Design a protein around this ligand. Structure first.
Ligand SMILES: NC1=N[C@@H]2[C@@H](O)[C@H](O)[C@@H](CO)O[C@@H]2S1
Length: 644
């Protein structure tokens, strides 16, 4: 597969060996970044096969000047028995030719091909713009290299929880250590043909005075000294005076006129509006029209679609584009998981109109705090933004996985296939999950509940799935090819294995040969539920959506409902009182929940499993601080906080 796929490809089924001896033409005139990649692949003389490299206008590629597409970042690539051609419309084009060339080379051999290629969307890449733990320095380094390989030309640095990015320390220069890291990032970005865009997020406490304006420009100047050549100002997720669009526009134009248009070498200048998606816009207010009218024409305006989280439609992007008077620079909120932090979002990229490239200036993905894990979606977004007309949702997902974890690709697909949906949430955004087994699941459960006979084949499909999930979990746990990825996903991988083991035991209950066997399967299931509760209380204990949820759309519900159904049938058959509940709750009481040190009833009496010091109660139909009073029972949202 070539990823992204080129705009035009012509293949011939001859192949050539890569030349043992060869003549490199244009080595000194061409993009040094592209020559460096080429020299690595060759690891030469006057005699032997000709390799021509260079940009349109160089002597090296004069013969090919009409084949080179007249598009920024375009290139012409050709392989035949006599010569190899690697010719960009511009320097970035040449690097990209090389990235394509690297994907052709296979066991020291190349296909005979001719490619003319270029991107459909001008700016393509990643905004590190989420809430939560910002990416590590090493993660960022890995990322920038990954962007070069996938022709992503943009990295927008904007972690909401970097205090030198947002309030109040947006006014302070980075300390020495962080500055030296940022400097290395910029350098690595430059080597991979990525624009490091430094963003600032000053709007929550900005004063519309000289003092704050000069501090902002002084901060941009410090970043410039660090090598930064592109800049952004974000006015998202704020209130008060900073949402004034006249002021915002004047500030951006001042930055443009006094800094961007005054330096020798500034590239992108981007802003994120306060009204950044249609549901947050006031159609009857002047906010977006004031930006579209006043903002200088080279300044980009970001947009996340019809909602905070949405996929981009033709109608949606028309609506914004008419108000801002330019093509929106898309901020796509997937695979960002900062509002469903107990889920991993490892499914394919899909839902964005593939015919609307002309209507967008840019397309950037906001990723998860899990940097390695995000590469599935990043790789896919790179493919989509480069060649949206040829974008293949599923093949690109598979290619991403095989790229990221070639030693355990099938295992990663298995894990990812069942870790895709968000579950219920306030943004209303959902993804498909476990689609291959969903119909067998649905039939199995329909039959079973009614007291009709299930299909054998559907029982086997479910069994095979659980088996494969265990194989995948254990193999991924031990994988040393991408350790950082394995560290990110490990808690989820544990929870995923438990889920599968639970499924297997629940299926053994359905089969349920005798009373003694059934009861042993039942007790095993209860212990696996407890184990899943332990992971959910000890791993990933963030303040917002703590814990670890996996296979939530189809698999866990199947297991749970099946478990509840067989327990009921057993109780009817044997007049028993086996507990039918599916999540472990050590307290007693509408299931209770445990979140960090809170004990909630799900929206008269709760008994805790020990005595605790009580902190407060917050009922809602409204609170009461309990001064560390010892507490086991409570009687009358409905949340008890304790010390634990
Ligand atoms: N421009 C936007 N700001 C927020 C981002 O920082 C968040 O990561 C995103 C997802 O919660 O929502 C909105 S989209």
């Amino acid at each position: 597969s070539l990823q992204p796929p080129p705009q035009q490809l012509i293949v011939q089924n001859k192949t050539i060996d890569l030349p043992a001896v060869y003549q490199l033409n244009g080595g000194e005139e061409a993009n040094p970044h592209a020559v460096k990649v080429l020299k690595e692949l060759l690891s030469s003389s006057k005699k032997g096969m000709l390799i021509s490299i260079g940009e349109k206008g160089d002597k090296s590629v004069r013969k090919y000047s009409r084949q080179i597409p007249d598009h920024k970042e375009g290139y012409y690539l050709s392989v035949n028995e006599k010569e190899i051609v690697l010719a960009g419309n511009d320097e970035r084009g040449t690097y990209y030719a090389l990235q394509t060339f690297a994907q052709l080379l296979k066991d020291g051999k190349l296909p005979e091909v001719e490619i003319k290629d270029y991107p459909s969307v001008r700016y393509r890449g990643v905004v590190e713009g989420f809430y939560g733990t910002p990416w590590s320095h090493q993660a960022r380094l890995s990322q920038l290299k990954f962007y070069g390989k996938n022709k992503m030309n943009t990295y927008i640095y904007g972690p909401k929880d970097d205090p030198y990015h947002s309030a109040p320390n947006w006014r302070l220069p980075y300390p020495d250590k962080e500055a030296a890291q940022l400097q290395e990032l910029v350098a690595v970005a430059n080597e991979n043909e990525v624009d490091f865009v430094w963003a600032i997020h000053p709007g929550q406490d900005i004063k519309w005075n000289k003092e704050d304006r000069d501090l902002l420009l002084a901060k941009f100047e410090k970043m410039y000294q660090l090598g930064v050549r592109s800049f952004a100002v974000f006015f998202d997720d704020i209130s008060g005076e900073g949402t004034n669009p006249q002021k915002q526009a004047e500030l951006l134009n001042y930055i443009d006129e006094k800094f961007a248009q005054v330096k020798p070498d500034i590239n992108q200048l981007v802003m994120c509006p306060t009204e950044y998606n249609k549901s947050w816009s006031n159609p009857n207010g002047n906010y977006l029209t004031t930006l579209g009218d006043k903002l200088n024409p080279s300044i980009q305006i970001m947009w996340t679609g019809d909602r905070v989280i949405s996929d981009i439609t033709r109608d949606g992007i028309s609506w914004i584009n008419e108000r801002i008077k330019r093509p929106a620079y898309i901020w796509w909120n997937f695979p960002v998981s900062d509002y469903v932090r107990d889920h991993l979002l490892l499914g394919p990229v899909y839902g964005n109109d593939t015919t609307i490239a002309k209507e967008m200036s840019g397309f950037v993905t906001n990723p998860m705090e899990h940097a390695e894990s995000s590469k599935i979606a990043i790789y896919s977004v790179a493919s989509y933004a480069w060649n949206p007309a040829k974008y293949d949702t599923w093949q690109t997902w598979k290619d991403a996985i095989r790229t990221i974890l070639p030693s355990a690709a099938e295992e990663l697909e298995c894990f990812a296939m069942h870790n895709s949906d968000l579950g219920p949430n306030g943004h209303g955004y959902r993804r498909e999950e476990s689609m291959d087994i969903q119909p067998a699941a649905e039939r199995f459960l329909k039959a079973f509940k009614e007291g009709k006979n299930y299909d054998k084949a559907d029982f086997e499909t479910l069994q095979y799935t659980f088996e494969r999930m265990k194989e995948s979990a254990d193999i991924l746990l031990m994988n040393t090819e991408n350790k950082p990825l394995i560290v990110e996903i490990t808690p989820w991988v544990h929870q995923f294995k438990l889920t599968a083991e639970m499924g297997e035991e629940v299926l053994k209950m359905v089969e349920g040969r005798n009373e003694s066997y059934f009861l042993r399967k039942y007790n095993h299931v209860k212990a696996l539920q407890q184990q899943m509760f332990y992971i959910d209380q000890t791993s990933n204990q963030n303040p917002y959506q703590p814990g670890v949820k996996t296979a939530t759309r189809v698999i866990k519900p199947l297991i749970d409902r099946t478990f509840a159904t067989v327990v009921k049938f057993f109780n009817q058959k044997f007049n028993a009182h086996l507990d039918a509940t599916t999540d472990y709750m050590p307290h007693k009481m509408l299931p209770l929940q445990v979140k960090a040190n809170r004990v909630l009833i799900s929206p008269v009496e709760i008994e805790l499993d020990a005595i605790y010091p009580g902190e407060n109660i917050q009922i809602n139909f409204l609170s009461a601080g309990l001064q560390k009073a010892p507490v086991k029972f409570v009687r009358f949202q409905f949340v008890l906080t304790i010390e634990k």
